RNA sequence: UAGUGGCGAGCGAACGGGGAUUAGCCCUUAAGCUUCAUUGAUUUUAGCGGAACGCUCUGGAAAGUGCGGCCAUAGUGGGUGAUAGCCCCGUACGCGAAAGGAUCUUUGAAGUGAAAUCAAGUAGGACGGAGCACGAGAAACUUUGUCUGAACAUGGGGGGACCAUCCUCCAAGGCUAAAUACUACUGACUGACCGAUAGUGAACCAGUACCGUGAGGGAAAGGCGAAAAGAACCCCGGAGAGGGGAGUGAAAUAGAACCUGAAACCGUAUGCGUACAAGCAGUGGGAGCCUACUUGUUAGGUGACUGCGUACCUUUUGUAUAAUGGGUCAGCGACUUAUAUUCAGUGGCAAGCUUAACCGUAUAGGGUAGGCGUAGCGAAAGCGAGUCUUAAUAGGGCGUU
RNA sequence: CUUGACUGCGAGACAGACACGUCGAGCAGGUACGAAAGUAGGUCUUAGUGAUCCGGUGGUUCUGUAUGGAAGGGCCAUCG
């Protein structure tokens, strides 16, 4: 070990065989304005798309 | 298979002797071997390490002169060298299998080029260089690497003065000394030991 | 492996200073001025391998103009009449016949006038 | 000969160097461009940094815990159970081969191939298909 | 990695393994360590011996050329008039100490260890701090500046708040070799280390000269020749300086400021062109003249005259720019290195691959601890060719020759 | 008259650097009205808003540093 992964990136981006999982923003603390249809569709654990991958796994020391 | 000067064949394996010559792997092994025998004993000094050089030489404006922060800058002739060396290592990793497979393809070329010579046993009597010269001159043999199964002290004391002869054991042989000497003398016990080691 | 670069720097400067010899002053004897003069000479020489083909053509055309007007014809009427006919003969050898072989040039301008252009 | 050997065409490369002349391809800048941060010495952009907006690793939430239960967990698939010696698959037996680390304690066997032999699995959990494929080809199971 | 962190920049374990090393003795008095006296032994501070070549060519000189040998536990050492195993000093290899020192070993002796007697102002606690990877945080454990304050082996503290139950140890007295760190200092050996602007600041009378009131800063400067054979004598000159000879030497345009002796810069000589001609000084055309040749449809040198023609850099939307930069020359002066990693190329092995420390008669071989791969899903328990969500065997996400 | 201003989702698109955002047939579970086809996942439409980290509150199948619990953490819903 001579490369330090960013610890805030490791709590945010868990790696699977399908990519790097993350959760969504906006499901915190203002949840009456939102419809159920918006709160239902930020609930899961999405993937991380192409524009973000190189930056995140450069932060998570994997590039 | 391989011929012995003592009138018989020895029937070697087609794996240790008589495989294809991987020129790339043998070249990697000889570059690795010549790297592992280099000592990195040098250093220069950087701009921190050359003596003195604390003050700015002049003030930065008014002097009409170019702009310096120390006498010992690497642009200056007193100053340091810019990417000054420190004692490093040049020893690289060759795999165990890659080593053994570069060996198996230079014993094969020592066979094909008629450069390998198998004898039944090679033993000198006395620690005399003249005796070992006479024993090699029967074989018509100058500039030879003698590989025995274990180096005897008589065979070691002779030929450690002799100019173009080297006496090694099987463990102590290397790709550079196999390719270097113009002929390679091995005993039958050395061919047994090479089949044990190399496969 | 420290390598001392003063033996190759010298030969490269000798090459540039040899290419610059014949020039005025520091153009021929100091490197930072000789180098620019050699590069500039090279640009002009590239440009002038083109303008050589431009300048010789104009001299041929001017000599053919002068030779044709002695026989009562322009340059342009001569070049038109030498294509109502078919001469395939160029400005170089027509200028050469304009100076040297004047009776042959007179024969050529009469065969251009014969085609009435 | 030491005089004669080279490597494969394409195995070493020349290591082109920046800053050696203008007819080399990398003069006067060395591939760095012109003024700005990423042409200076130490001209690095820090990892994650998006120019000053909130980067992805601070804009998305944190989502879970790591289990300390599973640091000593293990999985050994059915392709490997023929590789132990002695017709028994035990925890120490799976450590005698290098099939599983030291400091592992819990092994599940899952179905990823063919079990090969008739082995006995003491103290080792197995999935449904893997218990089926072990007991099919002569295996047994106790604890 | 777990944790930790304006949960930011970052900081960062442990359990469990693999090794290097090998020992525990005591407070009912010990190992050990010192200092002495002894018992043998080993090293060190100096040295001794140490093999084997002649003829010939070129040359100032032979080690080199040609030929023929010899030695070798000694053959790629140094220098000797050019390159030497055999010419010298050496080297491998054996020998060697009146006298000192040092390490180890006997076997006594005096000491010490040693604080007394199993630990009380101690454990614990309250405040305020510090440390433990841990920013007092659910905060254990350690330490304590203030204030307090226990039990006594059917005690006591630890197992990360805390509580029960188990497990494991006995704090408040001590002493302990090795593995470990470092090298101003010695000795040997080595270098894909430098070779006089380099390498130490410093090859030379260098921490000098010099600069500062001081602290402090800090240079420049190597080379005749193999041998001084370092120039007897004569001439000009001021019993000069410097030369012209003569001698020495292979060579003195190796003459002491001395190997080689570049460029900038400054001259003398010869050829040609230059005093009616306007500018980046060239370039295309081109007469004439002058030299060598041997002549011609050549080679070298000048270049009258003439067409075109506002350096280089750097910065910029753009520079001849009256924007920057450079007096010139010669030296020097800027993408390195380490460790982690990703991709490409190229090799070895292949459902496996690979070792790290370390061991090693040591680039071998050993050592597979560990790392990655053979399975994924889930935040996790877990379940697994599936899994998660879900009331759902539905949908959907991710995965599966 | 009444709660469809439902729960689980969600084929597929629009928008788009990313984070966000927009529309949505259909399926399951339960409901409004309507005799029944059917309409109903708020409002004619596009503004009315705010990331993360911290904390608070209610659940929970998860974890829970020897073990049984707790503490703290995780997920789900929600507030500042």
């Amino acid at each position: 070990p001579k490369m330090k992964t960013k610890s805030g990136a490791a709590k945010r981006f868990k790696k699977t065989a399908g990519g790097l999982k993350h959760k969504h923003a906006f499901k915190s603390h203002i949840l009456t304005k939102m419809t159920t249809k918006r709160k239902r569709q930020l609930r899961g654990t999405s993937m991380l798309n192409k524009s973000d991958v190189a930056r995140v796994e450069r932060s998570l020391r994997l590039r | 298979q391989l011929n012995v000067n003592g009138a018989q064949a020895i029937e070697v394996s087609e794996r240790t002797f008589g495989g294809e010559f991987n020129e790339t792997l043998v070249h990697q092994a000889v570059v690795a071997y010549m790297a592992g025998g280099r000592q990195g004993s040098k250093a220069q000094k950087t701009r921190s390490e050359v003596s003195g050089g604390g003050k700015k030489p002049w003030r930065q404006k008014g002097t009409g002169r170019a702009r310096a922060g120390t006498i010992r800058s690497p642009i200056w002739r007193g100053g340091g060298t810019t990417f000054a060396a420190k004692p490093r290592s040049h020893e690289q990793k060759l795999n165990k299998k890659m080593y053994r497979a570069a060996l198996r393809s230079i014993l094969a070329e020592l066979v094909r080029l008629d450069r390998l010579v198998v004898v039944a046993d090679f033993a000198v009597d006395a620690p005399k260089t003249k005796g070992l010269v006479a024993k090699l001159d029967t074989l018509g043999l100058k500039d030879v690497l003698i590989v025995t199964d274990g180096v005897d002290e008589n065979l070691y004391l002779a030929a450690r003065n002799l100019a173009h002869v080297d006496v090694r054991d099987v463990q102590g042989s290397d790709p550079v000394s196999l390719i270097a000497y113009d002929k390679v003398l091995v005993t039958v016990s050395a061919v047994k030991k090479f089949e044990e080691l190399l496969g | 492996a420290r390598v001392k670069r003063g033996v190759i720097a010298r030969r490269r400067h000798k090459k540039i200073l040899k290419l610059a010899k014949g020039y005025y002053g520091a153009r021929s004897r100091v490197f930072r001025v000789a180098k620019q003069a050699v590069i500039k000479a090279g640009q002009y020489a590239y440009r002038d391998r083109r303008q050589r083909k431009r300048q010789f053509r104009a001299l041929w055309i001017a000599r053919i103009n002068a030779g044709a007007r002695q026989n009562g014809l322009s340059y342009s009427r001569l070049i038109a009449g030498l294509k109502k006919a078919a001469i395939e003969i160029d400005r170089k050898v027509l200028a050469d016949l304009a100076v040297n072989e004047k009776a042959a040039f007179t024969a050529i301008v009469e065969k251009a006038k014969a085609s009435l252009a | 000969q030491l005089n004669d050997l080279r490597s494969a065409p394409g195995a070493r490369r020349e290591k082109h160097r920046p800053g050696r002349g203008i007819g080399s391809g990398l003069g006067k800048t060395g591939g760095r461009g012109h003024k700005g941060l990423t042409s200076r010495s130490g001209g690095k952009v820090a990892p994650g940094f998006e120019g000053g907006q909130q980067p992805l690793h601070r804009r998305l939430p944190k989502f879970g815990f790591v289990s300390l239960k599973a640091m000593d967990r293990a999985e050994v698939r059915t392709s490997e159970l023929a590789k132990v010696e002695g017709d028994v698959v035990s925890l120490q037996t799976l450590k005698d081969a290098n099939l599983i680390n030291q400091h592992v304690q819990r092994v599940k066997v899952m179905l990823s191939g063919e079990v090969g032999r008739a082995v006995t699995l003491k103290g080792i959990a197995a999935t449904k298909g893997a218990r089926a494929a072990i007991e099919a080809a002569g295996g047994k199971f106790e604890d």
Side-chain angles (χ1 to χ4, degrees), chain A residues 6 11-12 14 21-24 52 55 58 61, chain D residues 45 47-48 50 56-58 60-63:
Chain A
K6 189 181 294 291
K11 302 175 189 177
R12 263 64 177 252
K14 274 81 175 64
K21 300 197 267 77
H22 64 85
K23 302 288 273 285
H24 296 281
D52 297 334
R55 182 173 56 239
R58 182 171 173 270
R61 291 289 193 275
Chain D
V45 180
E50 292 179 355
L56 282 159
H57 60 273
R58 290 181 69 186
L60 298 177
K62 312 193 288 181
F63 68 111

PDB file of all heavy atoms in Angstrom, chain A residues 6 11-12 14 21-24 52 55 58 61, chain D residues 45 47-48 50 56-58 60-63:
ATOM      1  N   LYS A   6      -9.308   7.909  -1.553  1.00  0.00           N
ATOM      2  CA  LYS A   6     -10.088   8.938  -0.895  1.00  0.00           C
ATOM      3  C   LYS A   6     -11.183   8.280  -0.080  1.00  0.00           C
ATOM      4  O   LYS A   6     -11.975   7.504  -0.615  1.00  0.00           O
ATOM      5  CB  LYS A   6     -10.674   9.869  -1.937  1.00  0.00           C
ATOM      6  CG  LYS A   6     -11.328  11.082  -1.381  1.00  0.00           C
ATOM      7  CD  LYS A   6     -11.877  11.902  -2.494  1.00  0.00           C
ATOM      8  CE  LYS A   6     -10.792  12.490  -3.387  1.00  0.00           C
ATOM      9  NZ  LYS A   6      -9.941  13.550  -2.797  1.00  0.00           N
ATOM     10  N   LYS A  11     -16.915   5.581   0.835  1.00  0.00           N
ATOM     11  CA  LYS A  11     -18.207   5.505   1.494  1.00  0.00           C
ATOM     12  C   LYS A  11     -19.355   5.769   0.533  1.00  0.00           C
ATOM     13  O   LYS A  11     -20.495   5.420   0.840  1.00  0.00           O
ATOM     14  CB  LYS A  11     -18.228   6.512   2.634  1.00  0.00           C
ATOM     15  CG  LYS A  11     -17.113   6.263   3.611  1.00  0.00           C
ATOM     16  CD  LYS A  11     -17.011   7.299   4.694  1.00  0.00           C
ATOM     17  CE  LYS A  11     -15.746   7.047   5.454  1.00  0.00           C
ATOM     18  NZ  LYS A  11     -15.474   8.038   6.511  1.00  0.00           N
ATOM     19  N   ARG A  12     -19.072   6.372  -0.617  1.00  0.00           N
ATOM     20  CA  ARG A  12     -20.060   6.784  -1.598  1.00  0.00           C
ATOM     21  C   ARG A  12     -20.189   5.831  -2.774  1.00  0.00           C
ATOM     22  O   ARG A  12     -21.221   5.845  -3.443  1.00  0.00           O
ATOM     23  CB  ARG A  12     -19.703   8.171  -2.152  1.00  0.00           C
ATOM     24  CG  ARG A  12     -20.378   9.375  -1.559  1.00  0.00           C
ATOM     25  CD  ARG A  12     -20.053   9.587  -0.134  1.00  0.00           C
ATOM     26  NE  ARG A  12     -20.660  10.801   0.400  1.00  0.00           N
ATOM     27  CZ  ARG A  12     -19.992  11.903   0.703  1.00  0.00           C
ATOM     28  NH1 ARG A  12     -18.677  11.922   0.602  1.00  0.00           N
ATOM     29  NH2 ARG A  12     -20.623  12.956   1.176  1.00  0.00           N
ATOM     30  N   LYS A  14     -19.568   1.943  -3.881  1.00  0.00           N
ATOM     31  CA  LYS A  14     -19.229   0.542  -3.704  1.00  0.00           C
ATOM     32  C   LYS A  14     -19.103  -0.124  -5.065  1.00  0.00           C
ATOM     33  O   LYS A  14     -19.921   0.107  -5.954  1.00  0.00           O
ATOM     34  CB  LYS A  14     -20.273  -0.154  -2.838  1.00  0.00           C
ATOM     35  CG  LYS A  14     -19.986  -0.025  -1.350  1.00  0.00           C
ATOM     36  CD  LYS A  14     -20.432   1.293  -0.748  1.00  0.00           C
ATOM     37  CE  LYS A  14     -20.239   1.332   0.744  1.00  0.00           C
ATOM     38  NZ  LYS A  14     -18.800   1.236   1.084  1.00  0.00           N
ATOM     39  N   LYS A  21     -21.616   1.190  -7.757  1.00  0.00           N
ATOM     40  CA  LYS A  21     -22.926   1.586  -7.262  1.00  0.00           C
ATOM     41  C   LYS A  21     -22.857   2.913  -6.524  1.00  0.00           C
ATOM     42  O   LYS A  21     -21.882   3.214  -5.839  1.00  0.00           O
ATOM     43  CB  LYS A  21     -23.479   0.576  -6.269  1.00  0.00           C
ATOM     44  CG  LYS A  21     -23.693  -0.823  -6.706  1.00  0.00           C
ATOM     45  CD  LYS A  21     -24.618  -1.491  -5.709  1.00  0.00           C
ATOM     46  CE  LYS A  21     -23.916  -2.220  -4.592  1.00  0.00           C
ATOM     47  NZ  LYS A  21     -23.382  -1.333  -3.545  1.00  0.00           N
ATOM     48  N   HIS A  22     -23.938   3.682  -6.611  1.00  0.00           N
ATOM     49  CA  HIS A  22     -24.108   4.819  -5.722  1.00  0.00           C
ATOM     50  C   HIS A  22     -25.588   4.994  -5.433  1.00  0.00           C
ATOM     51  O   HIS A  22     -26.439   4.418  -6.104  1.00  0.00           O
ATOM     52  CB  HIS A  22     -23.512   6.098  -6.309  1.00  0.00           C
ATOM     53  CG  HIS A  22     -24.179   6.562  -7.561  1.00  0.00           C
ATOM     54  ND1 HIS A  22     -25.315   7.339  -7.555  1.00  0.00           N
ATOM     55  CD2 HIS A  22     -23.855   6.384  -8.859  1.00  0.00           C
ATOM     56  CE1 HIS A  22     -25.675   7.603  -8.795  1.00  0.00           C
ATOM     57  NE2 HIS A  22     -24.807   7.031  -9.608  1.00  0.00           N
ATOM     58  N   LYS A  23     -25.883   5.790  -4.413  1.00  0.00           N
ATOM     59  CA  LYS A  23     -27.246   6.192  -4.118  1.00  0.00           C
ATOM     60  C   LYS A  23     -27.501   7.549  -4.733  1.00  0.00           C
ATOM     61  O   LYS A  23     -26.604   8.206  -5.260  1.00  0.00           O
ATOM     62  CB  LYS A  23     -27.507   6.240  -2.621  1.00  0.00           C
ATOM     63  CG  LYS A  23     -27.254   4.959  -1.975  1.00  0.00           C
ATOM     64  CD  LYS A  23     -28.252   3.918  -2.273  1.00  0.00           C
ATOM     65  CE  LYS A  23     -29.423   3.958  -1.335  1.00  0.00           C
ATOM     66  NZ  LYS A  23     -29.028   3.414  -0.017  1.00  0.00           N
ATOM     67  N   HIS A  24     -28.739   7.987  -4.646  1.00  0.00           N
ATOM     68  CA  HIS A  24     -29.143   9.221  -5.286  1.00  0.00           C
ATOM     69  C   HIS A  24     -29.152  10.361  -4.290  1.00  0.00           C
ATOM     70  O   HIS A  24     -29.273  10.170  -3.081  1.00  0.00           O
ATOM     71  CB  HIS A  24     -30.527   9.070  -5.896  1.00  0.00           C
ATOM     72  CG  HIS A  24     -30.583   8.071  -6.997  1.00  0.00           C
ATOM     73  ND1 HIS A  24     -30.151   8.353  -8.270  1.00  0.00           N
ATOM     74  CD2 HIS A  24     -30.991   6.784  -7.011  1.00  0.00           C
ATOM     75  CE1 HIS A  24     -30.313   7.289  -9.030  1.00  0.00           C
ATOM     76  NE2 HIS A  24     -30.816   6.320  -8.289  1.00  0.00           N
ATOM     77  N   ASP A  52     -18.474   9.831 -15.504  1.00  0.00           N
ATOM     78  CA  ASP A  52     -18.074   9.914 -14.111  1.00  0.00           C
ATOM     79  C   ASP A  52     -17.081   8.843 -13.698  1.00  0.00           C
ATOM     80  O   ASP A  52     -16.443   8.994 -12.652  1.00  0.00           O
ATOM     81  CB  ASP A  52     -19.311   9.790 -13.231  1.00  0.00           C
ATOM     82  CG  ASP A  52     -20.285  10.918 -13.434  1.00  0.00           C
ATOM     83  OD1 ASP A  52     -19.848  12.016 -13.838  1.00  0.00           O
ATOM     84  OD2 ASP A  52     -21.488  10.714 -13.170  1.00  0.00           O
ATOM     85  N   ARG A  55     -13.158   9.649 -13.420  1.00  0.00           N
ATOM     86  CA  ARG A  55     -12.902  10.541 -12.299  1.00  0.00           C
ATOM     87  C   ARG A  55     -13.074   9.836 -10.958  1.00  0.00           C
ATOM     88  O   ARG A  55     -12.262  10.036 -10.045  1.00  0.00           O
ATOM     89  CB  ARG A  55     -13.820  11.751 -12.398  1.00  0.00           C
ATOM     90  CG  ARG A  55     -13.612  12.767 -11.318  1.00  0.00           C
ATOM     91  CD  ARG A  55     -14.428  14.000 -11.586  1.00  0.00           C
ATOM     92  NE  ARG A  55     -15.843  13.690 -11.733  1.00  0.00           N
ATOM     93  CZ  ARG A  55     -16.532  13.966 -12.825  1.00  0.00           C
ATOM     94  NH1 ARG A  55     -15.925  14.561 -13.827  1.00  0.00           N
ATOM     95  NH2 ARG A  55     -17.815  13.662 -12.911  1.00  0.00           N
ATOM     96  N   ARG A  58     -10.377   7.278 -10.469  1.00  0.00           N
ATOM     97  CA  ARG A  58      -9.107   7.916 -10.182  1.00  0.00           C
ATOM     98  C   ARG A  58      -9.069   8.396  -8.737  1.00  0.00           C
ATOM     99  O   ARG A  58      -8.026   8.321  -8.084  1.00  0.00           O
ATOM    100  CB  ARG A  58      -8.865   9.057 -11.175  1.00  0.00           C
ATOM    101  CG  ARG A  58      -7.563   9.779 -11.014  1.00  0.00           C
ATOM    102  CD  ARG A  58      -7.295  10.723 -12.151  1.00  0.00           C
ATOM    103  NE  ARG A  58      -6.122  11.534 -11.887  1.00  0.00           N
ATOM    104  CZ  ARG A  58      -6.181  12.709 -11.277  1.00  0.00           C
ATOM    105  NH1 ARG A  58      -7.353  13.177 -10.916  1.00  0.00           N
ATOM    106  NH2 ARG A  58      -5.091  13.423 -11.047  1.00  0.00           N
ATOM    107  N   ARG A  61      -8.568   4.883  -5.736  1.00  0.00           N
ATOM    108  CA  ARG A  61      -7.293   4.769  -6.457  1.00  0.00           C
ATOM    109  C   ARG A  61      -7.221   3.470  -7.260  1.00  0.00           C
ATOM    110  O   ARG A  61      -6.676   2.454  -6.826  1.00  0.00           O
ATOM    111  CB  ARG A  61      -6.133   4.845  -5.478  1.00  0.00           C
ATOM    112  CG  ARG A  61      -5.912   6.168  -4.820  1.00  0.00           C
ATOM    113  CD  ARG A  61      -5.390   7.172  -5.804  1.00  0.00           C
ATOM    114  NE  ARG A  61      -4.869   8.374  -5.172  1.00  0.00           N
ATOM    115  CZ  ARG A  61      -5.609   9.414  -4.825  1.00  0.00           C
ATOM    116  NH1 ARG A  61      -6.913   9.384  -4.996  1.00  0.00           N
ATOM    117  NH2 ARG A  61      -5.048  10.474  -4.277  1.00  0.00           N
TER     118      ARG A  61
ATOM    119  N   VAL D  45      -3.960  18.455 -11.178  1.00  0.00           N
ATOM    120  CA  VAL D  45      -5.311  18.722 -10.722  1.00  0.00           C
ATOM    121  C   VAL D  45      -5.659  17.605  -9.757  1.00  0.00           C
ATOM    122  O   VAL D  45      -5.460  16.429 -10.075  1.00  0.00           O
ATOM    123  CB  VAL D  45      -6.287  18.788 -11.908  1.00  0.00           C
ATOM    124  CG1 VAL D  45      -7.693  19.053 -11.443  1.00  0.00           C
ATOM    125  CG2 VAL D  45      -5.839  19.856 -12.869  1.00  0.00           C
ATOM    126  N   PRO D  47      -7.323  14.769  -7.439  1.00  0.00           N
ATOM    127  CA  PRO D  47      -8.335  13.786  -7.839  1.00  0.00           C
ATOM    128  C   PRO D  47      -9.692  14.028  -7.199  1.00  0.00           C
ATOM    129  O   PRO D  47      -9.803  14.255  -5.995  1.00  0.00           O
ATOM    130  CB  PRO D  47      -7.722  12.449  -7.411  1.00  0.00           C
ATOM    131  CG  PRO D  47      -6.652  12.783  -6.502  1.00  0.00           C
ATOM    132  CD  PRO D  47      -6.132  14.107  -6.892  1.00  0.00           C
ATOM    133  N   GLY D  48     -10.722  13.983  -8.035  1.00  0.00           N
ATOM    134  CA  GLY D  48     -12.064  14.317  -7.655  1.00  0.00           C
ATOM    135  C   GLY D  48     -12.486  15.725  -8.012  1.00  0.00           C
ATOM    136  O   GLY D  48     -13.681  15.968  -8.190  1.00  0.00           O
ATOM    137  N   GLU D  50     -13.634  19.028  -9.555  1.00  0.00           N
ATOM    138  CA  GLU D  50     -14.424  19.294 -10.746  1.00  0.00           C
ATOM    139  C   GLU D  50     -14.406  20.760 -11.127  1.00  0.00           C
ATOM    140  O   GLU D  50     -15.310  21.234 -11.817  1.00  0.00           O
ATOM    141  CB  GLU D  50     -15.860  18.827 -10.541  1.00  0.00           C
ATOM    142  CG  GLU D  50     -15.995  17.335 -10.451  1.00  0.00           C
ATOM    143  CD  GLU D  50     -17.413  16.888 -10.230  1.00  0.00           C
ATOM    144  OE1 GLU D  50     -18.282  17.754 -10.046  1.00  0.00           O
ATOM    145  OE2 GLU D  50     -17.660  15.667 -10.223  1.00  0.00           O
ATOM    146  N   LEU D  56     -18.629  14.503  -7.108  1.00  0.00           N
ATOM    147  CA  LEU D  56     -19.487  13.335  -6.925  1.00  0.00           C
ATOM    148  C   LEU D  56     -19.286  12.649  -5.591  1.00  0.00           C
ATOM    149  O   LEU D  56     -20.242  12.118  -5.020  1.00  0.00           O
ATOM    150  CB  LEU D  56     -19.214  12.334  -8.025  1.00  0.00           C
ATOM    151  CG  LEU D  56     -19.808  12.595  -9.376  1.00  0.00           C
ATOM    152  CD1 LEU D  56     -18.976  11.797 -10.265  1.00  0.00           C
ATOM    153  CD2 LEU D  56     -21.192  12.033  -9.349  1.00  0.00           C
ATOM    154  N   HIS D  57     -18.067  12.640  -5.087  1.00  0.00           N
ATOM    155  CA  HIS D  57     -17.786  12.014  -3.811  1.00  0.00           C
ATOM    156  C   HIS D  57     -18.137  12.888  -2.625  1.00  0.00           C
ATOM    157  O   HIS D  57     -17.769  12.532  -1.505  1.00  0.00           O
ATOM    158  CB  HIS D  57     -16.314  11.628  -3.735  1.00  0.00           C
ATOM    159  CG  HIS D  57     -15.390  12.790  -3.864  1.00  0.00           C
ATOM    160  ND1 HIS D  57     -14.954  13.262  -5.079  1.00  0.00           N
ATOM    161  CD2 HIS D  57     -14.849  13.605  -2.929  1.00  0.00           C
ATOM    162  CE1 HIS D  57     -14.155  14.293  -4.883  1.00  0.00           C
ATOM    163  NE2 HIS D  57     -14.081  14.527  -3.587  1.00  0.00           N
ATOM    164  N   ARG D  58     -18.792  14.032  -2.826  1.00  0.00           N
ATOM    165  CA  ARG D  58     -19.310  14.819  -1.720  1.00  0.00           C
ATOM    166  C   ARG D  58     -20.756  15.202  -1.920  1.00  0.00           C
ATOM    167  O   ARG D  58     -21.334  15.852  -1.051  1.00  0.00           O
ATOM    168  CB  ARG D  58     -18.491  16.092  -1.503  1.00  0.00           C
ATOM    169  CG  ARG D  58     -17.139  15.810  -0.962  1.00  0.00           C
ATOM    170  CD  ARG D  58     -16.357  17.047  -0.719  1.00  0.00           C
ATOM    171  NE  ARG D  58     -16.908  17.819   0.374  1.00  0.00           N
ATOM    172  CZ  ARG D  58     -16.466  19.017   0.717  1.00  0.00           C
ATOM    173  NH1 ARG D  58     -15.474  19.564   0.039  1.00  0.00           N
ATOM    174  NH2 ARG D  58     -17.015  19.665   1.726  1.00  0.00           N
ATOM    175  N   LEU D  60     -23.315  12.955  -3.382  1.00  0.00           N
ATOM    176  CA  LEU D  60     -24.051  11.724  -3.197  1.00  0.00           C
ATOM    177  C   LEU D  60     -23.879  11.244  -1.767  1.00  0.00           C
ATOM    178  O   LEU D  60     -22.858  11.522  -1.145  1.00  0.00           O
ATOM    179  CB  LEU D  60     -23.543  10.652  -4.163  1.00  0.00           C
ATOM    180  CG  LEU D  60     -23.686  10.931  -5.655  1.00  0.00           C
ATOM    181  CD1 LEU D  60     -23.077   9.817  -6.450  1.00  0.00           C
ATOM    182  CD2 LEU D  60     -25.119  11.117  -6.024  1.00  0.00           C
ATOM    183  N   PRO D  61     -24.843  10.545  -1.185  1.00  0.00           N
ATOM    184  CA  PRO D  61     -24.719  10.152   0.216  1.00  0.00           C
ATOM    185  C   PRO D  61     -23.817   8.941   0.401  1.00  0.00           C
ATOM    186  O   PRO D  61     -23.415   8.270  -0.547  1.00  0.00           O
ATOM    187  CB  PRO D  61     -26.156   9.835   0.614  1.00  0.00           C
ATOM    188  CG  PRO D  61     -26.774   9.414  -0.612  1.00  0.00           C
ATOM    189  CD  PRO D  61     -26.173  10.209  -1.707  1.00  0.00           C
ATOM    190  N   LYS D  62     -23.494   8.689   1.662  1.00  0.00           N
ATOM    191  CA  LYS D  62     -22.752   7.513   2.080  1.00  0.00           C
ATOM    192  C   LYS D  62     -23.765   6.416   2.348  1.00  0.00           C
ATOM    193  O   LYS D  62     -24.844   6.699   2.866  1.00  0.00           O
ATOM    194  CB  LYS D  62     -21.965   7.820   3.350  1.00  0.00           C
ATOM    195  CG  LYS D  62     -21.198   9.105   3.274  1.00  0.00           C
ATOM    196  CD  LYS D  62     -20.208   9.220   4.377  1.00  0.00           C
ATOM    197  CE  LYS D  62     -20.889   9.457   5.697  1.00  0.00           C
ATOM    198  NZ  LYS D  62     -19.919   9.604   6.809  1.00  0.00           N
ATOM    199  N   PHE D  63     -23.452   5.169   1.990  1.00  0.00           N
ATOM    200  CA  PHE D  63     -24.528   4.181   2.069  1.00  0.00           C
ATOM    201  C   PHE D  63     -24.141   2.831   2.668  1.00  0.00           C
ATOM    202  O   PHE D  63     -24.429   1.771   2.125  1.00  0.00           O
ATOM    203  CB  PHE D  63     -25.254   4.023   0.735  1.00  0.00           C
ATOM    204  CG  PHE D  63     -24.486   3.392  -0.397  1.00  0.00           C
ATOM    205  CD1 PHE D  63     -24.838   2.130  -0.848  1.00  0.00           C
ATOM    206  CD2 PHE D  63     -23.583   4.117  -1.133  1.00  0.00           C
ATOM    207  CE1 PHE D  63     -24.202   1.559  -1.903  1.00  0.00           C
ATOM    208  CE2 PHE D  63     -22.942   3.544  -2.194  1.00  0.00           C
ATOM    209  CZ  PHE D  63     -23.267   2.272  -2.592  1.00  0.00           C
TER     210      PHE D  63
END
